[PDB]
Amino acid sequence: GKQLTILGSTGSIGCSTLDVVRHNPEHFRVVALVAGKNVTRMVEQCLEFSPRYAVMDDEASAKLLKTMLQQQGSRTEVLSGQQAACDMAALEDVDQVMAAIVGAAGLLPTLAAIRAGKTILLANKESLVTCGRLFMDAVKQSKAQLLPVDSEHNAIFQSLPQPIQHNLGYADLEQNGVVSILLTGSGGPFRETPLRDLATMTPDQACRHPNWSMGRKISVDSATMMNKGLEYIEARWLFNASASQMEVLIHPQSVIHSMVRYQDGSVLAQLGEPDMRTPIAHTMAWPNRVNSGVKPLDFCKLSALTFAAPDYDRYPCLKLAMEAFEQGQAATTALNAANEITVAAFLAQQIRFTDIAALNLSVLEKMDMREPQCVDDVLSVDANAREVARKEVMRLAS
Amino acid sequence: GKQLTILGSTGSIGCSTLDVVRHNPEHFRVVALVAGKNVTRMVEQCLEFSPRYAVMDDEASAKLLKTMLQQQGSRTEVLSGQQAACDMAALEDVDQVMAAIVGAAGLLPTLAAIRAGKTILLANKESLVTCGRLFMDAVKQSKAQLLPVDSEHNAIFQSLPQPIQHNLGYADLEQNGVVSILLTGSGGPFRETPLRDLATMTPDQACRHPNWSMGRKISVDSATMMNKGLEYIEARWLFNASASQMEVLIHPQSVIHSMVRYQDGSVLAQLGEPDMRTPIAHTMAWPNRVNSGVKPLDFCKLSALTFAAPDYDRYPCLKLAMEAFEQGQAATTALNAANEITVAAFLAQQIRFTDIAALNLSVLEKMDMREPQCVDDVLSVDANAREVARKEVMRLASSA
Ligand SMILES: NC(=O)C1=CN([C@@H]2O[C@H](COP(=O)(O)OP(=O)(O)OC[C@H]3O[C@@H](n4cnc5c(N)ncnc54)[C@H](OP(=O)(O)O)[C@@H]3O)[C@@H](O)[C@H]2O)C=CC1
Numbered sequence: 117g118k119q120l121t122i123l124g125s126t127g128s129i130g131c132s133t134l135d136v137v138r139h140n141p142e143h144f145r146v147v148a149l150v151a152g153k154n155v156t157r158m159v160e161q162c163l164e165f166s167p168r169y170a171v172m173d174d175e176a177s178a179k180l181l182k183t184m185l186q187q188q189g190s191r192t193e194v195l196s197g198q199q200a201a202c203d204m205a206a207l208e209d210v211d212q213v214m215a216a217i218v219g220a221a222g223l224l225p226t227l228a229a230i231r232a233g234k235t236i237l238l239a240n241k242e243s244l245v246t247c248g249r250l251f252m253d254a255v256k257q258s259k260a261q262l263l264p265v266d267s268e269h270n271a272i273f274q275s276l277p278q279p280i281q282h283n284l285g286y287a288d289l290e291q292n293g294v295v296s297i298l299l300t301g302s303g304g305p306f307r308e309t310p311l312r313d314l315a316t317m318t319p320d321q322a323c324r325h326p327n328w329s330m331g332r333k334i335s336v337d338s339a340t341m342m343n344k345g346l347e348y349i350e351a352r353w354l355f356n357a358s359a360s361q362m363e364v365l366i367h368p369q370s371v372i373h374s375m376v377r378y379q380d381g382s383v384l385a386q387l388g389e390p391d392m393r394t395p396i397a398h399t400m401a402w403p404n405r406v407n408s409g410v411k412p413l414d415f416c417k418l419s420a421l422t423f424a425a426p427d428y429d430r431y432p433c434l435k436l437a438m439e440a441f442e443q444g445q446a447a448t449t450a451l452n453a454a455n456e457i458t459v460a461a462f463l464a465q466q467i468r469f470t471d472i473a474a475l476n477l478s479v480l481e482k483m484d485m486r487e488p489q490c491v492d493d494v495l496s497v498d499a500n501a502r503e504v505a506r507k508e509v510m511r512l513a514s
Numbered sequence: 515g516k517q518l519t520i521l522g523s524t525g526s527i528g529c530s531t532l533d534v535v536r537h538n539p540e541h542f543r544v545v546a547l548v549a550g551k552n553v554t555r556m557v558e559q560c561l562e563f564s565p566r567y568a569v570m571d572d573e574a575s576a577k578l579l580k581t582m583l584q585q586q587g588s589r590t591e592v593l594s595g596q597q598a599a600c601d602m603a604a605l606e607d608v609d610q611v612m613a614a615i616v617g618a619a620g621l622l623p624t625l626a627a628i629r630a631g632k633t634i635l636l637a638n639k640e641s642l643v644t645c646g647r648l649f650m651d652a653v654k655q656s657k658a659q660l661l662p663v664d665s666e667h668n669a670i671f672q673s674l675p676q677p678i679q680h681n682l683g684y685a686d687l688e689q690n691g692v693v694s695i696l697l698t699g700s701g702g703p704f705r706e707t708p709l710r711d712l713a714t715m716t717p718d719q720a721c722r723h724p725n726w727s728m729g730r731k732i733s734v735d736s737a738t739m740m741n742k743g744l745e746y747i748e749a750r751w752l753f754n755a756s757a758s759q760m761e762v763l764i765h766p767q768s769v770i771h772s773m774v775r776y777q778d779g780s781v782l783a784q785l786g787e788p789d790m791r792t793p794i795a796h797t798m799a800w801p802n803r804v805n806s807g808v809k810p811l812d813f814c815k816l817s818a819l820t821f822a823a824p825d826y827d828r829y830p831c832l833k834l835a836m837e838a839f840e841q842g843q844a845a846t847t848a849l850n851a852a853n854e855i856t857v858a859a860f861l862a863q864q865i866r867f868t869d870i871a872a873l874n875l876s877v878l879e880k881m882d883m884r885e886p887q888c889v890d891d892v893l894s895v896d897a898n899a900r901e902v903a904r905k906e907v908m909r910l911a912s913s914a
């Protein structure tokens with residue numbers, strides 16, 4: 117079947133990927149698993165999927181893993197550190213690399229897979245949010261096939277014509293009859309909150325998305341629409357879309373995952389149950405399909421589907437992201453880094469809900485760095501933006 | 515430059531297709547126009563599009579047209595009759611044939627295109643409602659490309675993978691990751707009417723689709739969901755779908771035109787403004803795209819989108835169509851034919867709204883014909899079913 121390396125196997129996307137393989141043991145062979153510190157989950161995955169290699173970024177973790185796998189009678193070879201992670205991404209015999217490491221740490225292993233011309237199941241945000249120019253250049257250079265895993269981008273990918281799907285990132289949209297890309301977002305828990313009350317929203321209220329339940333960081337990003345802002349940045353790189361070829365639409369029910377508008381009037385959309393196994397199984401099977409374990413969407417048990425235009429007075433972060441894109445990878449990197457700092461401060465009750473957007477702006481205004489030319493440059497912008505952001509939080513809470 | 519024949523150029527689909535040509539004069543050349551009796555419309559189209567040929571099915575119409583064009587200095591050659599219509603569909607240099615003749619009259623001209631291996635932009639309902647097996651067998655033999663123009667089928671086509679699109683009729687759904695085809699219908703004006711009030715609904719009520727504005731016959735078919743039943747028949751042929759691979763959903767807003775359900779849980783859908791130029795331009799440009807004149811769908815000005823399962827007590831015609839399919843082309847042809855007669859009788863106030871389903875069933879029960887083996891056989895089932903249906907109407911309008 118297809119030989120796969122899973123980068124970030126022990127996290128949420130990694131576990132969902134392995135559930136797809138579990139459903140399709142004849143179509144997929146796990147060659148390598150890479151993770152950080154979750155030795156316990158990693159052991160269980162090595163014992164189920166029999167990979168050739170298992171890598172832990174953390175050395176103490178790698179040593180403990182080796183001792184457990186030995187105790188358990190497994191001969192999976194245990195490696196450690198960043199170079200081994202990149203090596204697994206570049207293994208000559210692997211076909212697909214699930215790029216699911218979180219944060220800047222996913223950058224070099226992902227680039228290693230790109231440079232190796234692998235099919236990349238891309239689920240690491242920083243890759244296009246921070247390194248969109250560098251990675252799209254590298255993809256063109258190696259002819260690597262990117263298959264986006266995030267629900268929105270995968271929905272768009274499924275709704276795009278074949279010549280774009282092949283050649284993803286270099287194809288011309290207009291030449292292929294595409295007018296625009298329609299990014300849909302829930303609008304978050306404060307979609308209908310009076311604007312006066314936004315300054316007093318609590319972390320528990322912000323993380324209380326009506327319908328979904330997910331991590332606190334992403335819940336807050338959904339409340340600010342920073343999440344859609346970051347997906348805007350990725351979509352422009354992934355789909356070769358100009359600002360006029362992008363539309364953002366609030367869709368509270370999140371049944372339509374995103375859409376593509378065509379020259380003749382047609383709009384194609386992908387819909388489905390809210391379950392990451394669907395987009396993951398799509399990318400793993402492309403251009404064919406596999407069972408993912410996700411149940412068929414029941415159209416008779418849906419809330420009525422509604423749409424609205426995002427109000428930038430309600431979602432300044434969405435506008436900030438759009439503007440940042442225009443300023444370049446230094447601005448997008450700085451925004452993403454600043455946002456991690458301000459959201460964490462919000463969750464720690466150091467700042468108010470509305471201070472997230474205000475301090476994100478403040479960081480971008482204060483900085484002005486030059487366009488990154490390599491991953492080290494991006495890492496540098498990221499580090500500097502966090503420091504500026506932390507000082508801003510301290511001043512404010514000071 | 516794609517060379518085309520337009521069968522039924524003077525009708526609604528015909529006019530919409532020439533608007534697409536008008537918007538894209540450098541991508542499409544009109545070689546031949548074919549119609550029935552609308553000499554006036556035909557004259558204008560010939561002056562504007564300069565086809566090599568124009569045919570009218572009606573002989574006097576063809577004669578009237580021949581002179582007017584010679585007068586206005588048109589170089590188009592005017593022919594007449596069905597054989598001429600079929601020859602246009604088979605012209606060696608023609609790339610695409612827009613199959614937009616209404617009724618049993620569209621069968622032989624559409625078939626001529628299929629036998630010629632043409633790309634067919636299929637609009638004519640009778641082609642697959644009555645000759646589904648014959649026509650799909652024919653397209654498989656000549657490797658003709660079918661491109662469905664009807665909104666539902668076109669939406670499904672656009673939501674299907676490339677291996678199915680390019681082998682439409684022959685490809686296996688399952689092997690291509692497709693679990694089912696989701697056909698959406700508005701549910702008509704009586705979607706929420708008390709069942710016991712259906713018997714008293716008037717033609718004007720049935721034809722007053724709250725949200726849509728179309729011909730009287732189609733409006734009644736929308737009210738009974740016979741329209742969806744006919745499309746179910748077409749879809750099973752066109753997409754090679756078994757009964758378990760078909761779903762019918764009521765979607766009152768008709769924004770989603772139909773959908774395709776995949777193995778991984780994904781559902782692909784096509785949405786757009788309710789303008790036939792969209793699906794027409796889709797088929798004309800496929801696998802590429804062209805401007806159609808249709809404005810982008812404004813998602814901020816929509817009614818909330820809803821869905822529901824059809825209740826067969828409310829829509830017995832839908833269920834009759836599904837059952838007819840299982841009995842073969844003799845049954846689907848008889849149902850289509852009986853429904854023409856019973857809808858016309860309802861509209862003429864000879865029978866009740868609810869007598870349409872009742873009499874359609876009664877015709878089907880009285881018919882006992884073999885599977886048709888060629889178009890002529892289908893025409894005979896049609897002729898016979900019409901007469902059975904007329905007598906049922908008269909029995910009901912006269913006696914008990
Ligand atoms: N969750 C979702 O619905 C979606 C998430 N995304 C993106 O996908 C990526 C992964 O998300 P998710 O799976 O939710 O995140 P998780 O935090 O659940 O998992 C992250 C994975 O990365 C591993 N990891 C962390 N640091 C390193 C490192 N230095 N080297 C190697 N592995 C490391 C973790 O290992 P361990 O736990 O063992 O320490 C874990 O396996 C993120 O970038 C996220 O933004 C995109 C689309 C959808």
Ligand SMILES: NC(=O)C1=CN([C@@H]2O[C@H](COP(=O)(O)OP(=O)(O)OC[C@H]3O[C@@H](n4cnc5c(N)ncnc54)[C@H](OP(=O)(O)O)[C@@H]3O)[C@@H](O)[C@H]2O)C=CC1
Pocket residue numbers: 521522523524525526527528548549550551552553570571599613614615616617619620637638639640663664665790
């Ligand atoms: N209207 C719609 O939105 C849709 C319609 N369809 C189907 O497409 C087909 C065409 O529909 P529509 O355009 O609305 O129908 P119309 O009634 O508007 O047009 C019918 C066309 O066929 C011509 N015609 C009739 N008899 C003959 C004949 N014997 N030989 C040659 N031409 C003939 C008419 O010519 P003339 O007027 O000159 O006499 C006219 O050009 C129908 O089967 C319909 O069910 C499918 C999907 C959508």
Ligand SMILES: O=P(O)(O)Cc1ccc(-c2ccccc2)cn1
Pocket residue numbers: 300301302303304325327328337338343344368369370390
């Ligand atoms: O689209 P966003 O807002 O960035 C994140 C998000 C939030 C909610 C949902 C959602 C999922 C299921 C039901 C209702 C809402 C999906 N994604």
Ligand SMILES: O=P(O)(O)Cc1ccc(-c2ccccc2)cn1
Pocket residue numbers: 698699700701702723725726735736737741742766767768788
């Ligand atoms: O799907 P049906 O019911 O057979 C025909 C039909 C009726 C109404 C509509 C419709 C179109 C636009 C707005 C509201 C309803 C579309 N098609």
